[PDB]
Each structure stands twice: as structure tokens, then as C-alpha cells.
Design a protein around this ligand. Sequence first.
Ligand SMILES: O=C(O)COc1c(C(=O)O)sc(-c2ccc(O)cc2)c1Br
Length: 297
Amino acid sequence: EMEKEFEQIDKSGSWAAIYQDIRHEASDFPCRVAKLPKNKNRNRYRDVSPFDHSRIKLHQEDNDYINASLIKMEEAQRSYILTQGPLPNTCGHFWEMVWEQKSRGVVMLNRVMEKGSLKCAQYWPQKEEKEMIFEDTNLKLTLISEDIKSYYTVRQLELENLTTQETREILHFHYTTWPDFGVPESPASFLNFLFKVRESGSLSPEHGPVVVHCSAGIGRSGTFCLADTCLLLMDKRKDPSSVDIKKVLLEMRKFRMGLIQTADQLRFSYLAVIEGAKFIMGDSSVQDQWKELSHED
Ligand SMILES: O=C(O)COc1c(C(=O)O)sc(-c2ccc(O)cc2)c1Br
């Protein structure tokens, strides 16, 4: 049981130790392509790169590199593309990936500016009348509408492949109150947001994997994916006890390094999954409670 283990680690005050053990056991694969001199300016962080085996390849001959990893959870049967928050020069690559991978949703877990620094380019239009055109990948992006809430915003964009003139609806889920190297204000705020993403259909298997990103694409992004996969696993079996959170996280780290970044985010993951299990195990009323508790209005 994850809940018993939680209170065992909490009483013995050893989350740091548990987290470091995961760091010590985590997979280590080469990131040769990411470290090529020509891709120096395609990486936001020198120490955060995609493994070659799970990296997302852009469908072009020039340079097919982008700092993004395909987290393919086999047993859970859901995939996510964990990526860099995009740079001024890679916004075109970012949407190229979204188009080629057939994603329907983009989950942004950071703010463009955090602690005085620009953690991410402005890679989507903030105003309907001001559409963006990414000349390097031949794509146009238009803000169609947006539903602003207390701590997250949901944007409808239209992505058009200018080459074929085909268009697609991309849903943008922006969490604006998740501090970097930090955790949500409560498991309710988080679960409420996670459920807005789920309800949108964006995570459905009929779509390409959902794109998830904070700034480095591993701290907050990892925390979000871990909670989701863990809920989906126990959901498939309707058995909360058959889910090993640390084991699931290690598994995720086979596809991208550094997933979840502090011991507190790991602790929060447990907390969110434990709270979310109530819904999965058939108490539907908690959903309305998380919404109340989150104060999205
Ligand atoms: O998303 C988070 O929780 C934190 O994300 C972040 C950063 C940020 O957003 O400023 S920097 C960062 C990082 C950590 C270790 C490194 O060697 C290089 C970069 C991570 Br990881």
C-alpha cells in the first residue's frame, strides 16, 4: 500500500533519502545527438538533455533535433512527450513536433517569466487578431478562445500546416501557480487541473501523445506524468495497492532523465495519487470537492 508507505516515510522523516535512492538507481543512457555542437542552441539547459533512444525526431532532413522525449508507458498504455519549454529559435520545431506527432493537447506547467528569468518563449498567440506564423516549419497558429481561471487557463488554438492547408484544434492547458522546484498549493488544485486535461479527451489513445512541458521539462512535468500514470494504472486494475509509485517513476526515467526534481515533489506525487484514488475507486463526489477547494473562480 502506497498510503502505509507514505506515513512510514513521513514518520521516519526520510523523503530526502528515498528520493536520492531513486536518483542513484535511475537509468543512464547516452544523449549523443543532444550534445552535438550544432544543437547547442536548441537546448535551454546544458545539463538537461533527451536520451537518444527516446528522443523525438523532427521529420526533416536539415536537422531533426529537439529537446523532447517520448515517455512510453507500456503497461499503463499511455504516452506523453516531455519537452523543454521552447526557446526563441525552437518555437517552429515545437509546433512541428506537435503536428507530426498528432498531439491534441499541450500542458504548460510554468509561467513565461519566473524568478526574474524568462523560462520559456512566447510560443502561442495571446490575442485572436494576432496569429503567429512560424516561417521555418511553415505553420500558422491562431488563438481561437481562452477560458481564464484562478490559477490555470485553457486555450483553444488552431494549428494549420501551411504546406497542406490542413488545420487542427490544439487545446492548451496552462497551470500558472506551480512554483519552479516547488509543488501545487494542494492535491485538490492539482487533481482538478489534471482532470480538466483528462476530460478534454487530449489523453485519449486515438490522439498522439500529449505534450507536457515546464521549463526544463522534468521537474513539474515529471510530477504531472507520474501522478497521471499511477492513477491510470490502478484505474485499469481498480486496485490501488497494485501500484508502486517509485517503481513507476523509475520506469519513466528510462525515457528521460531527472523526472521529478526534489523530494517534496515526490512526496506531493504520493499525496495526489492517494487523493485521486478516491475518485478512481468510485467516489465521484471528490471531483466537485477538488473544484471547490481549488477556487478556480
Ligand atoms: O520544473 C521544475 O521543478 C524545475 O525546473 C528546472 C529549472 C527552472 O524551472 O528554473 S532549472 C532546472 C535544472 C536543474 C539541474 C540542472 O543541472 C539544470 C537545470 C530544472 Br529541473
